[PDB]
């Protein structure tokens, strides 16, 4: 029943697996699959009205990005500068760079910076011959500094089927769509978002771990004004179970997602996602959509995601009364300690 | 307003 | 240094000592005497205006009630109802009934009876005679029901001196005052409130144990939800170290009033009341006055009281989002594992 | 408005 992703997929025309096993990381936890689904299938409709992860096979969201690559791209995506992170490890934990000034003892393991397209290649290209060991991994937004046919392609996706997603869930508007590209093996540690997420699959093959936002107390997130906010503070690869306890009865949701693919990734869902081993580079796209109005009145019971809003508006509030986000913890301390603990 | 929530998401806003 | 009431007091007239250390209960913690002035020396109007306590031993506030008594009182204190506790032990922990109804497991040690003032006396004398040991507490806030002696005595409390001090101050307005007789040995757990007050001692002799607001950490006040808000939960005469640890770590001021003495209790100061044992019977009569208006903007560094206003609003707000006041310490929990502690 | 108190005290409204 906790069968992951399941059983490899073939490729067509007997191309042989797609991936195996051994391309996956080694996790402590078990993992049951996210539904494959056609999107004319009503239980996919379904899951998506109801918040629940599931993987479109058949969408054609991004169809003209299917012939992407280095090549393709370092021609026409332009000459604006690219956001390129740099780290000695595979874990490319997310930080908010506008936050390190209030936990100046925060030691970002991963460090960005900006270039073109031609000299991420190139960068890219100088470690693979070299043999070096260090990762590095695009992330940026599409701008209007992209090329012609970049546009083009832009103008080919399937907006007939996103906008009536779009209005069919209420959502508000496109905030944008972030352009990831990275090495096989990269891993962005588990988080969540506050927006809603499709995420489409273009080159390459990449494993994507979900957890309900119901899962809040075992995922122990860092301290909201902490630089690393809304991201766990778990390392999956070695979890220490003294500070997480927790951790321990956590269950996820896996899936592999490839070209042509669409993972839903509803607000608020925690997602950890990795560049399957000796895979090759990945190439990804998302559509970030701001979620639907917070409801006139609440209705009872509170859902998992409502609880999760109100304690980060607990953690806001305080820091700004307090006038200073370092006393957020002992002030909770003091509330707790001997009154409901 | 406590359930009230923002719009952030690992990316420059 | 930590002397606690200090030396017994002399009778004017070389009528013995006032009380003995013999009168006072014994507690594990140390306390030191809370400053003796007159109302027109320049310390005691310092204290009162650094929300400090003082006891004033001149200020002439209840001058004519000094003559009461129950036989005086029963004879023109009026027809109307008055709130008399009933307990079989020495404390009489205050609660909250309206509160009652979210913690239907909480068992009050004392019990509330309406009565008319000649029937508070006659089952006080009915005790006494008996040799029984139940105990009974007379909380009645003085209305327009008091008979036309009282009303005079009223009138002739010493208004220049108070309004005056209400103005410095500047307070809020004068929402009540309670009359408070209790039997030898009776004793008013320690607990907080949200107004200014002054305690006019008029019969008898009570020890006061007050606390800083920043002592809230050893304090363990109950749940804001919960009937016993504002009140400790510590139990003074058997204090549970495991549940209560830092109670190891409090520090009192303390001091005996007696007649004529006003003792004033800050805001937010916690304080214990006990009447002396085989001191009789007491009389007292408080003033309490709102506090002065919340400032328009905060200054850093915030006081302890101020963090103390916001932690109960915390709770508060908590408690209405969640649409159950039960829910509170479970989310509070939740938000502070393995992220704050 | 989070340092705003009410006026409770040990005794009814
Ligand atoms: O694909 C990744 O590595 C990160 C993606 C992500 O976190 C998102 O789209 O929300
Ligand atoms: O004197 C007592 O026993 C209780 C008094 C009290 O708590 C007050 O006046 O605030
Ligand atoms: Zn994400
Ligand atoms: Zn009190």
Redesign the interface.
């Known amino acids: 029943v906790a069968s992951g992703s399941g059983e490899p997929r073939e490729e067509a025309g007997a191309l042989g697996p797609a991936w195996d096993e051994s391309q996956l990381r080694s996790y402590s936890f078990p993992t049951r699959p996210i539904p494959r689904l056609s999107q004319s299938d009503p239980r996919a409709e379904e899951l998506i009205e109801n918040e629940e992860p599931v993987v479109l096979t058949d969408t054609n969201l991004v169809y003209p990005a299917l012939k992407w690559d280095l090549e393709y791209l370092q021609e026409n995506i332009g000459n604006g500068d690219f956001?390129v992170y740099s780290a000695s490890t595979h874990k490319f934990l997310?930080y908010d760079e506008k936050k390190m000034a209030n936990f100046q003892n925060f030691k970002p393991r991963s460090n960005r910076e900006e270039m073109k397209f031609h000299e991420f290649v190139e960068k890219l290209q100088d470690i693979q011959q070299r043999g070096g060991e260090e990762r590095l991994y695009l992330?940026q937004?599409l701008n209007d500094t992209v090329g012609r046919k970049i546009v083009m392609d832009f103008l080919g996706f399937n907006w007939n089927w996103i906008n009536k997603q779009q209005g069919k869930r209420g959502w508000?508007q496109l905030?944008?769509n972030?352009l990831l590209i990275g090495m096989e093996g990269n891993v962005?540690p588990a988080?969540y978002?506050?927006?809603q997420?499709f995420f489409a699959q273009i080159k390459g093959y990449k494993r994507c771990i979900l957890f309900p936002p119901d899962q809040?107390?075992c995922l122990?997130?860092?301290?909201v004004h902490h630089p690393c906010?809304?991201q766990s503070?778990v390392d999956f690869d070695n979890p220490d179970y003294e500070?997480?306890?927790?951790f321990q009865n956590v269950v996820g949701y896996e899936t592999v997602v490839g070209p042509g693919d669409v993972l839903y990734i509803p607000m608020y869902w925690w997602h950890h996602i990795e560049s399957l081993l000796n895979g090759g580079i990945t190439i990804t796209v998302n559509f970030?959509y701001?979620?639907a109005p917070?409801?006139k009145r609440?209705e009872?019971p509170?859902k998992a995601h409502?609880?999760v809003?109100?304690?980060?508006?607990?953690?806001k509030?305080?820091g700004e009364?307090?006038?200073?986000p370092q006393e957020?913890?002992p002030?909770?301390?003091?509330?707790?300690?001997?009154?409901?603990? | 307003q406590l359930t009230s929530y923002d719009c952030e998401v690992n990316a420059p806003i």
């Open positions: 956001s997310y992330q937004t508000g905030t944008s972030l962005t988080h978002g506050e927006q997420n809040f107390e122990y997130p860092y301290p906010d809304r503070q500070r997480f306890p927790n970030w701001k979620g917070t409801p609440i009872y509170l409502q609880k809003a109100i304690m980060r508006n607990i953690e509030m305080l009364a307090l006038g200073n957020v913890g002030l909770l301390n003091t509330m707790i300690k001997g009154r409901y603990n």
